[PDB]
């Protein structure tokens, strides 16, 4: 994953991605990458944190405690955020529990807010957990969409898959010089050789 494009040459605001230093990110590599995708109001972007408060990380997607991964949030006033209350991008609220880390909620049902349970017909209480985002490109500054991408690493006993140190320096010849080709290190002069290796 070419991490250079997102920090070295990027125009993405609020690149605070606690857990790993953005510098030399390409030189450190974890096991697997879990790409996320979110659309949040302008003010509610701060809710991405180790628990904190609010309607995010309590009923919405939750950030685990002591989590290691990077988070990015960039303004999306255009590119599928247009006039009228958008049909998509609706809340996830009114859950009996406070959710657990890393679990995904793809289930919808009428909430319970009283003694007797309504048998499927809405009325008193029994609130529908979902409400749509009523934003548009003519909103303020703290309410415009800010698409959030969360890159989740993993710390476990598994070998790292996404890697790649990159780095590059030129080659010299006929001069005593230090070399670190693939881990091996030594000192000496490098000359052209006629020996043939197997592929």
């Amino acid at each position, epitope marked *: 994953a070419d991490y250079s494009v997102l920090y070295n040459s990027a125009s993405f605001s609020t690149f605070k991605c606690y857990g790993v230093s953005p510098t030399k990110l390409n030189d450190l590599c974890f096991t697997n990458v879990y790409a996320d995708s979110f659309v949040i109001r302008g003010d509610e972007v701060r809710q991405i944190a180790p628990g904190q408060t609010g309607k995010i990380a309590d009923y919405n997607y939750k950030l685990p405690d002591d989590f290691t991964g990077c988070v990015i949030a960039w303004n999306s006033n255009n590119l599928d955020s247009k006039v009228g209350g958008n049909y998509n991008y609706l*809340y996830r*609220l*009114f859950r*009996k529990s406070n959710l657990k880390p890393f679990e995904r909620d793809i289930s919808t049902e009428i909430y319970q*807010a*009283g*003694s*007797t349970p309504c048998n499927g017909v809405e*009325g008193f209480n029994c609130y529908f957990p979902l409400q749509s985002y009523g934003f548009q490109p003519t909103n303020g500054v703290g309410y415009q969409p800010y698409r959030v991408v969360v890159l989740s690493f993993e710390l476990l006993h598994a070998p790292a898959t996404v890697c790649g140190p990159k780095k590059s320096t030129n080659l010299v010849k006929n001069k005593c010089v230090n070399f670190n080709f693939n881990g091996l290190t030594g000192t000496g002069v490098l000359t052209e050789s006629n020996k043939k290796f197997l592929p």
Partner: antibody
Amino acid sequence: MQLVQSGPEVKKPGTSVKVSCKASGFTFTSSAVQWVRQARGQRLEWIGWIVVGSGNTNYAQKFQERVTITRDMSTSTAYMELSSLRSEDTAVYYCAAPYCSGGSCFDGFDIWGQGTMVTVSS
Amino acid sequence: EIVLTQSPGTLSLSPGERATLSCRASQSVSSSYLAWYQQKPGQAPRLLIYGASSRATGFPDRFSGSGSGTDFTLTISRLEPEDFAVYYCQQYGNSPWTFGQGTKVEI
């Protein structure tokens, strides 16, 4: 467990009106609010219900028009505006909300207020 | 939807009452979605029984009544003269959430 309402507002026959119900002592984030009508020596007419956790409301047969609610999530309040005020609207509006804390709560509307006193006179 | 018109009008007896009040309904309303408020002169109402299947958190005892869908009855059994004020039936579930006519009491 307390709920304080604004003072008696005096207005003109048909400009506007707005009433504030401050909710305290219970979790206002996930609850419901209702508004009714009262008078002297007269019955009670239900007006409109508000889920303050998520804005969804309907209104009585007399109150679909000239009536819309206002959320005002902050300050734990609830606003509700009436337009085209009529003479026979000298009413105490009141407000009610269930005692909710945690997500599942009591059914009956147990927490009430005291209401205002609006006089649409000259 | 509104044909409730609670049958009792004004009843006037000293304590020693076995009186009952009825909240008739147009259609059988599912229980536990009911309410029975108690308005007071110059004050705010209270709540006594939330759905004809239990009793509220804490309130004066010696009266608790329940009924069917079309006839949501209630009863009072020797209550003190302090609880002599206007009652109000109520319904939930179907919008609009309409109240009742109200019942009057006297000594």
